[PDB]
Design a protein around this nucleic acid. Structure first.
Length: 295
RNA sequence: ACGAGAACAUGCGCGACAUUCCGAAGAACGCUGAA
């Protein structure tokens, strides 16, 4: 049951990539899954549905004009083609067939208006009272245009879909990304049946494109890599919880194929464990959502 | 179990100092009009 989940952001979001100063306009499926797990644990729900039947996608840019999917890594002005990152759903088939030209790719890049990124310079006055000093730091945020929003597609049974609806409503108050609970990431989310995507997903093409940041199991990896065009993205971070350890602990470093990576042989994903001797297992979504296309 | 959590762009600071609404300037010029 693939359900579109559109997110409208009221306040700017941080979405850090490596540092607090930087910012991204989207987040990986794992970052969303980790937020969904944290929420389910707060609301005292069973994690079996999320860990066994929920399939999600990286949040993708959406505009009133169009919904943007990630640019497939398919061999085809090379600058114009490399600058392009997201292609509207209507132009995805044209891009796959090679019917797109460099000027058309430039127009597609200009078409997206997800938002306007910025850097907010904050200060910490915690040490001023102890003969210390104010400490400047920078938070990179991204402000969506009013029509613009981030959407994700969630697939699963009816039970996990309803659980997702509950977690999503709680999540909007919780927020997403970094510096949430410090002014950022408040969003309001709608869950609906989308005719566009379900029709798009009902295609049996010769190539498979990874909607979500995903990694195959070892046995899956050996068949999948042959003839694959892909971009290994390091997935790293600290553990966010009150019960994992007394102090803040980094997760084990993970590498996942990025969204838009094209694999000839489809691989199902796996919820990996990036924990290192903690009081609970830190789950890292790496399951795979596939858009089959014809090239 | 969201490159995450905690974190006041904050503290101090007179839109202020100097600067004549002055200078020149006769209320007086022609003497006529009507019956």
């Amino acid at each position: 049951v693939v359900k579109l989940v559109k997110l409208t952001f009221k306040s700017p979001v941080h979405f850090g990539m490596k540092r607090l100063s930087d910012s991204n306009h989207t987040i990986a499926a794992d970052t969303l899954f980790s937020a969904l797990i944290i929420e389910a644990l707060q609301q005292q729900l069973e994690l079996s549905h999320l860990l066994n039947n929920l399939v999600i996608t990286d949040l993708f840019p959406y505009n009133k004009t169009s919904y943007f999917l990630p640019k497939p890594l398919i061999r085809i002005g090379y600058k114009a083609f490399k600058k392009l990152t997201y292609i509207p759903v209507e132009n995805y088939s044209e891009y796959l067939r090679g019917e797109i030209d460099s000027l058309e790719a430039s127009k597609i890049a200009e078409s997206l208006n997800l938002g306007k990124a910025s850097l907010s310079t904050k200060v910490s006055l915690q040490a001023v009272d102890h003969n210390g000093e104010s400490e400047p730091y920078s938070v990179g945020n991204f402000t969506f245009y009013p029509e613009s929003g981030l959407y994700f597609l969630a697939k699963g049974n009816a039970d996990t879909i309803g659980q997702l609806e509950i977690l999503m409503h709680a999540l909007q108050y919780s927020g997403i990304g970094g510096k949430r609970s410090a002014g950022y990431g408040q969003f309001r989310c709608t869950i609906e049946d989308s005719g566009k995507f379900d029709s798009l997903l009902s295609q049996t093409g010769n190539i498979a494109i990874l909607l979500s940041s995903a990694m195959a199991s070892d046995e899956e990896l050996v068949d999948c890599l042959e003839d694959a065009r892909y971009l290994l993205k390091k997935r790293t971070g600290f553990v966010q919880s009150k019960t994992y350890a007394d102090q803040l602990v980094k997760k084990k470093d993970f590498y996942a194929f990025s969204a838009g990576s094209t694999f000839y042989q489809k691989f199902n994903g796996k919820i990996f464990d990036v924990s290192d001797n903690g009081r609970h297992s830190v789950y890292r979504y790496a399951k795979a959502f596939w858009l089959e296309g014809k090239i």
